[PDB]
């Protein structure tokens, strides 16, 4: 039988009997109200259940129903536009069906609707008797205008097709494929189920190559991320985190977005769930909602602690499911510190040894196993394809102390740090990225991509980072030397560093021409700024030895029009100017500055 | 519907051990069930089933276990968990930490019965905070403004006047009266000494304001389980008044460090191992269960705003109680020992204080168009003035520029006119903003760097 | 080459047998097939972290920072599986690689490892941030078996003297650079400026190398004497007269 009975209750811990043959970390339903919990010990016919919800009013001799599964996700059509908690409860259906502002104890709405009918097309050259393997696409559901929801055979399933449905409209409970292996059948609907803590398998796991574009000049130029990459951001109040989330959501070369709240303040979660449905992007010359390619996992700080800890495992398992369709998925975790605190509470409730700063002994192993699921892959199964998951994960060091075990482990693992900074945000400098602390390690991997597609960019990035370092090195010296007595080469460095800092690194995302700065615009601007730097340096160095030498004042007096045209480059607009027009204008400034410097040489 | 069947009574006490009574042969024990004990001398006591296993139930008695025996003492199991009667008639009433009246009025007729543990608000239903709660205190309303549906703690320490500030906010708080009716206050106080409990009850009757106020008192020598129950009775009353009777509710929770003290005491009776710095491992989840019973929700005109009041040991903000509270709530207001020693009231320091939702409370149609500008310029001038005051003793005032002397004049007049207020003085947000302009007019308008020229043109000159 | 791989997603308790499988293979190859084996153990901090996680479940007595009370013995059963033996040609050399948590050499993992192993090579974040390669800071580094593997017939007669004088001048150069940060350059005597010039030339010539450069010992020794030559010979107080009068005048 699937029923055992409650022997004893003490806090969230339930102990149940007749539980013989129940398995470690299975989920159960406890009591007449069917509270969820998981099995944490076995002893004889008894089990100990860690109940997730409130055990108040549970009684001895209550039923316990065993579910044959560990913690697992329903994966199938109806994920796009969904709101889930950390254990996949559909928060927007629970509200609609209950007509209540609360979440009931023991609510049991299924994660995906078994009510809606989905428009299904088979693979058209599959036939009865075909040989089929895990990851094989056997149909498509036309879920919305953006996502073809590819129906795939589960991993660990295989055989000979005994039946496949004709085209039509089906429930998530209708069997659409049947197959046989060793004379044993399997019947399959559109929805599969997968354990959150098991990595979804792939044919091969591949080096990351192509950039993830954000549309931001800083980020995309100075500190690039690859598709399949791993990134951290400092998650703190004044720093302006929303530019990352909105750039990824609206403008990135992702196909799909997964957003995870780990344990946020009630009112902070409400702003994300307010703003995300209202965002839009333009596709084939038509405006589309962001929620056609997006799903949200949401957890306020009073949701069950097991949901707070499961939250990132639900979000990555949902991401790995769309990777397997051959899409590129971006994942955002709202703070991984709020997850590590739930991990500390659970291990504290279990009375585990307090290791480092009260965190469990496995904290670093859990974070390494999480970020290890990022990457480009060659998918399982027959239609040859590649996909990827990229992780961005915020982290919240106490008072900026990076020696914190969670922050230290995170920055020990991730390959990019986008150091958003309150001290820059207070200057109205946007985006707030600290270009002295921020870094990317993917530059040896991206080399052969830039080399092929842009070619001149790698030298330009190198000189730009040097100018932005020399202007830090000069920042003390200028206070002693009094600006005027400085070398003309170094006055050129200071005031081209000002040009880069004010007109290249700043990008006002509310202005129509700079919402999204494409990479040809981004290299075009930097090419001209560094060309002017080289020419200004050459004009001084040609004459400084004994002539009536060139000075940075002479250059500003002789070329102030060109120096204004350079500050004017950011206003060029891909909505109204063609790529060829922007290229022609930036080439014309390069002719004009050559004619101006040749009139001084 | 109704429970209908008769209550069992038992003489099967197996053991008595500190605050716990253990019974055996109990018929299908219910966890967290309420039970009534009668002692050998006919005294009556109450308890809650702390744990169950097979035929055994263990009861924490709310009163002491003294005078209980094995032979003669008997216990009646009520059949159900703790529920509160609730109504709109609880406004103007005074209760103890277990919901019994202490005001010489009758017991509450229920409009409903509710489980005090409640249920979590759905993240899909909760909507972002909006217009201001006017507390009447210029250091909060001017520079740390509170949005309807925010939760924002006051951080204090031993001997500071946080109970006087709490009583002043309770006497003065309301909606801003732009261009009370649908307002209520639920005041809950934990571990209160008798002198402080008498101060609250006396001051709210004497200054007339009781008709808006529901008051729960738990004294320092009441049973410590009533201290666990008190926040849950208070928030169960705030949830009825806000999300059914459509009121805007302000909930004041007095000394959460006295709540955490009792939470540790219950955990030790369960024989649980002490967690970090002495408190239970689950104390974040436990506080978050109180604090996140807050906010606005879609489809309802009411709201709950919270002010948790805390006491920090050694004045140290890194202790678990103020630390974990900072991860759940969205601001802090900071009570200061140096302002208290200089005899300023209220001794609130505006530099470390913050309201994170302030931008959603202030501005045109919600306070006045200049509030966002005036708050930022006052903060800047106070920060600069504190720096000049520190260097005055290093260099001597004869070294200071004329610009430094304007800031050092502002500093002294800000603390006398703006920060200092009477415990029975009530300022609207408009008196708070107008006292702000009387201080900003110390400076030439070209020094007011944070204020745009449009705002200066309308508000800098004195009017006729 | 023989490789054993346990990756970040593989089971944790395999990590506590992985180095024992590898060292058993090195012991067959060295002490039965007579080969010279180099054994590389990659991130022993992952081994120690898996060992802590296993031991925490049995509730064995904790040592410092929550590691098992026996962690010294356990690491010693791995690191003592190295060396030469009587009558057999083969040998095992071990080069375990460690990650120090928060760069702290006093943490139990680098601490109990330094108590067992015959030295350490120390890779320094402050040299890496300055774009030097390899980032090897010599001061926290050691080799114990160096003292008898060098000198006359082994390498060159100066090797034991030059090495000790380079350590002395580098330690003093660090002390002068630390003095400069308080008092500024105008306070420094010319003798302080000699050590502060040695410091700059040592990190550029002796330390910095690039990833495929393969110097002889004799190049390393003569690059040693060139930096030492900066100092007037009476300052070279680790070196006896009979070494100075033979190698300094070149």
């Amino acid at each position: 039988s699937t029923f055992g009975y409650v022997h004893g209750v003490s806090g969230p811990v339930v102990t149940a009997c007749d539980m013989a043959g129940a398995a470690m970390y299975e989920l159960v339903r406890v009591g007449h109200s069917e509270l969820v919990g998981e099995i944490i010990r076995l002893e004889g016919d008894m089990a100990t259940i860690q109940v997730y919800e409130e055990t108040s009013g549970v009684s001895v001799g209550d039923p316990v129903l065993r579910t044959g599964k560990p913690l697992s996700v329903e994966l199938g059509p109806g994920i796009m536009g969904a709101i889930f908690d950390g254990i996949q409860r559909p928060l927007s259906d629970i509200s609609s069906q209950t007509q209540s502002i609360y979440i009931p104890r023991g609510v049991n709405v299924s994660a995906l609707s078994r009510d809606i009918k989905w428009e299904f097309i088979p693979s058209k050259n599959l036939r009865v008797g075909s040989h089929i393997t895990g990851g094989d696409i056997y149909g498509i559901v036309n879920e919305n205008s953006l996502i073809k929801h590819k129906i795939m055979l589960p991993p660990r399933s295989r055989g000979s097709v005994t039946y496949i449905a004709p085209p039509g409209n089906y429930d998530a409970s209708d069997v659409v494929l049947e197959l046989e292996f060793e004379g044993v059948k399997e019947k399959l609907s559109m929805v599969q189920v997968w354990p959150v803590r098991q990595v979804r398998p792939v044919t091969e796991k591949l080096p990351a190559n192509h950039p993830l574009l954000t549309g931001q000049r800083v980020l995309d130029a100075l500190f690039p991320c690859v598709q399949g990459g791993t990134t951290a951001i400092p998650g703190a109040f004044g720093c302006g985190k929303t530019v990352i989330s909105q750039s990824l959501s609206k403008y990135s070369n992702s196909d799909v977005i997964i957003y995870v709240g780990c344990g946020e303040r009630g009112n902070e979660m409400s702003e994300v769930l307010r703003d995300f449905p209202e965002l839009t992007m333009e596709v084939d010359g038509k405006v589309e909602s962001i929620m056609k390619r997006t799903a949200l996992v949401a957890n306020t700080s009073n949701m069950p602690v097991a949901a707070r800890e499961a939250s990132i495992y639900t979000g990555i398992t949902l991401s790995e499911y769309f990777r397997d369709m051959g899409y590129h998925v971006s994942m955002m975790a709202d703070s991984t510190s709020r997850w590590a605190e739930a991990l500390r509470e659970i291990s504290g409730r279990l009375a585990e040894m307090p290791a480092d700063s009260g965190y469990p002994a496995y904290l670093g192993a859990r974070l390494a196993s999480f970020y290890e699921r990022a990457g480009r892959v060659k998918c399982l199964g027959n239609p040859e394809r590649e996909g990827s998951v990229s992780i961005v994960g915020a982290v919240s060091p106490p008072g900026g102390d990076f020696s914190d075990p969670v922050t230290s482990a995170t920055l020990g693992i991730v390959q990019v740090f986008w150091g958003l900074d309150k001290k820059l945000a207070q200057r109205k400098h946007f985006p707030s990225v600290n270009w002295l602390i921020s870094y990317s390690k993917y530059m040896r991997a991206l080399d052969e991509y830039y080399d092929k597609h842009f070619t001149e960019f790698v030298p330009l990035r190198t000189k730009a980072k040097e100018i932005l370092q020399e202007e830090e090195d000069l920042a003390e010296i200028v206070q002693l030397v009094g600006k005027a007595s400085l070398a003309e080469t170094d006055k050129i460095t200071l005031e081209v560093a000002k040009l880069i800092k004010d007109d290249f690194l700043q990008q006002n995302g509310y202005t129509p021409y700079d919402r999204f700065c494409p990479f040809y615009k981004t290299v075009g601007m930097l090419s001209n700024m560094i060309s002017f730097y080289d020419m200004a340096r050459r004009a001084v160095e040609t004459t400084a030895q004994s002539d009536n030498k060139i000075t940075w004042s002479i250059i500003r007096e002789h070329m102030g029009e060109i120096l204004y045209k350079l500050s004017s480059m950011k206003f060029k607009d891909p909505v109204k100017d063609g790529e060829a027009k922007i290229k022609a204008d930036y080439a014309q400034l390069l002719e004009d500055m050559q004619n101006a410097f040749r009139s001084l040489e | 519907n109704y429970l209908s069947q008769p209550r069992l009574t038992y003489k099967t006490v197996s053991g008595v051990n500190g605050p716990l009574v253990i019974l055996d042969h109990v018929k299908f024990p219910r966890y967290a069930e309420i039970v009534h004990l009668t002692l050998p001398d006919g005294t009556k006591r109450s308890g809650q089933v702390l744990e169950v296993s097979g035929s055994k139930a263990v009861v924490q008695v709310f009163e002491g276990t003294s005078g209980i025996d094995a032979k003669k003492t008997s216990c009646e199991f009520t059949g159900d968990i703790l529920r509160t009667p609730v109504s709109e008639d609880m406004l103007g009433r005074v209760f103890n930490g277990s919901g019994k009246p202490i005001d010489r009025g009758p017991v509450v007729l229920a409009e409903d019965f509710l489980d005090i543990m409640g249920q979590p608000i759905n993240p899909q239903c909760r909507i972002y905070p909006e217009e201001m709660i006017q507390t009447g205190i210029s250091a909060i309303d001017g520079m740390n403004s509170i949005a309807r549906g925010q939760k924002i703690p006051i951080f204090s320490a031993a001997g500071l006047p946080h109970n006087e500030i709490a009583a002043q906010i309770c006497r003065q708080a309301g909606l801003v009266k732009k261009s009370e009716e649908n307002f209520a206050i639920v005041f809950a106080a934990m571990g209160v000494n008798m002198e402080t409990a008498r101060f609250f009850k006396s001051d709210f009757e004497e200054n007339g304001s009781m008709d808006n106020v529901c008051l729960f008192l738990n004294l320092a020598n009441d049973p410590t389980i009533e201290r666990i129950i008190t926040p849950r009775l208070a928030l169960t009353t705030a949830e009825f008044l806000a999300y059914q009777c459509e009121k805007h509710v302000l909930v004041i929770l007095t000394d959460m460090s006295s709540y955490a003290e009792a939470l540790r005491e219950v955990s030790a009776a369960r024989e649980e191992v002490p967690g970090r710095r002495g408190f239970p491992g689950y104390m974040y989840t436990d506080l978050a269960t109180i604090y996140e019973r807050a906010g606005r929700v879609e489809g309802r005109n009411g709201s709950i705003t919270q002010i948790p009041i805390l006491t920090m040991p050694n004045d140290d903000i890194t202790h678990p109680i103020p630390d974990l509270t900072g991860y759940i709530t969205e601001g802090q207001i900071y009570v200061d020992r140096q302002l208290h020693n200089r005899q300023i009231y209220p001794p609130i320091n505006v530099l470390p204080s913050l309201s994170r939702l302030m931008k959603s409370a202030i501005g045109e149609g919600m306070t006045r168009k200049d509030h966002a500008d005036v708050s930022n310029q006052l903060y800047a001038c106070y920060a600069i003035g504190k720096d000049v005051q520190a260097m005055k003793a290093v260099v001597g005032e004869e070294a200071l520029t004329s610009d430094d002397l304007l800031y050092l004049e502002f500093l002294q007049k800000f603390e006398k006119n703006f920060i200092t207020q009477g415990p029975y003085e009530n300022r609207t947000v408009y008196e708070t903003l107008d006292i702000g302009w009387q201080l900003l007019r110390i400076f030439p308008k070209e020094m007011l760097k944070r204020i745009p020229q449009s705002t200066l043109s309308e508000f800098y000159p004195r009017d006729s | 080459v023989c490789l054993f791989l346990n990756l970040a997603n593989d089971p944790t308790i395999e990590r506590i047998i992985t180095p024992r499988l590898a060292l058993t293979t090195a012991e067959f190859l060295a002490y039965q097939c007579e080969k010279h084996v180099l054994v590389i153990l990659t991130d022993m901090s992952s081994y120690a972290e898996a060992l802590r996680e296993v031991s925490a479940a049995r509730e064995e007595v904790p040592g410092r920072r929550g590691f098992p009370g026996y962690m010294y013995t356990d690491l010693a059963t791995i690191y003592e599986r190295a060396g030469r033996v009587e009558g057999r040609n083969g040998s095992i050399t071990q080069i375990p690689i460690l990650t120090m948590p928060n760069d702290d050499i006093t943490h139990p993992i680098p601490d109990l490892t330094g108590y067992i192993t015959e030295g350490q090579i120390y890779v320094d974040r402050q040299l890496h941030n300055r774009q030097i390669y390899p980032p090897i800071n010599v001061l926290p580094s050691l080799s114990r078996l160096m003292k008898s593997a060098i000198g006359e017939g082994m390498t060159r007669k100066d090797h034991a003297d030059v090495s000790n004088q380079l350590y002395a001048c580098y330690a003093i150069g660090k002390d002068v650079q630390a003095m400069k940060a308080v008092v500024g350059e105008e306070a420094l005597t010319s003798d302080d400026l000699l050590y502060l010039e040695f410091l700059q030339k040592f990190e550029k010539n002796f330390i910095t190398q690039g990833p495929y450069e393969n110097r002889t010992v004799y190049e390393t020794l003569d690059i040693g004497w060139q930096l030492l030559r900066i100092f007037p010979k009476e300052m070279l107080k680790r070196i006896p007269q009979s070494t100075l009068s033979e190698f300094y005048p070149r």
């Binding site: 009375a351 040894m353 | 024989e271 191992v273 002490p274 | 509730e59 007595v61 904790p62």
Partner: peptide
């Protein structure tokens, strides 16, 4: 913490041996 555990374990063993003696009474 390591001494507050172990004392719990010794108490648990005593309660088990006590109950397992009541099975002989």
């Amino acid at each position: 913490f390591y001494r507050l555990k172990k004392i719990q374990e010794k108490k648990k063993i005593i309660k088990e041996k006590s109950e397992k003696d009541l099975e002989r009474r």
